[PDB]
Amino acid sequence: DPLEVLFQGPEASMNLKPQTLMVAIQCVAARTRELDAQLQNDDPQNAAELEQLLVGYDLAADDLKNAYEQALGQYSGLPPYDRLIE
Amino acid sequence: DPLEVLFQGPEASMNLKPQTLMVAIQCVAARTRELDAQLQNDDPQNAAELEQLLVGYDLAADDLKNAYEQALGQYSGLPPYDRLIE
């Protein structure tokens, strides 16, 4: 993804259990939905910070999704991504 | 101890941006607090499922923390781990 590496740099190697990717995905989706509902009526300075944080949350969720899609090919018994976030 | 592996299996090789690990740590902590709070007002019916979900969330938080401790020795300018979960 061209513009993405430009803004955030490349993937890095790390070690995590597959379960941890599932948890990270649920919690990041959960927190994002909550914070989404908190934009409506903030003072302008605070809303800016919140918007800037959500940029980071959304990209992270994207990053975790890509990793999960690979994981769907390397393990057995993982729920489909769509079930994970719902 | 391990233990650990007996119960949760080994670490797997993953590719994620370092930011993504930071965002995941932050959201897992935030979300775990919120669910801890909900527990105080759950009947035992729902409580047991939620308790069992939290075992998972907590183990993943530990898994994420270990990865971050490694990260603190692989990259420059990372915040202290406590600033992520505050």
Curated annotation (Swiss-Prot), chains A, B:
Forms a heterotetramer with Tse2 consisting of two Tse2 dimers and two Tsi2 dimers. Formation of the complex inactivates Tse2 enzymatic activity. Disruption phenotype: Deletion of Tsi2 is lethal in the presence of Tse2. Keywords: Disulfide bond. It comes from the Bacteria. Immunity protein that plays a role in preventing early activation of toxin Tse2. Binds to a large surface of Tse2 and thereby occludes the active site to specifically inhibits Tse2. Transmembrane segments: none annotated. InterPro entries: T6SS_Tsi2-like, Toxin_immunity_effector, Tsi2. The gene is tsi2. This is Immune protein Tsi2. Gene3D superfamilies: 1.10.287.2500. The keyword Disulfide bond applies. The keyword Transport does not apply.
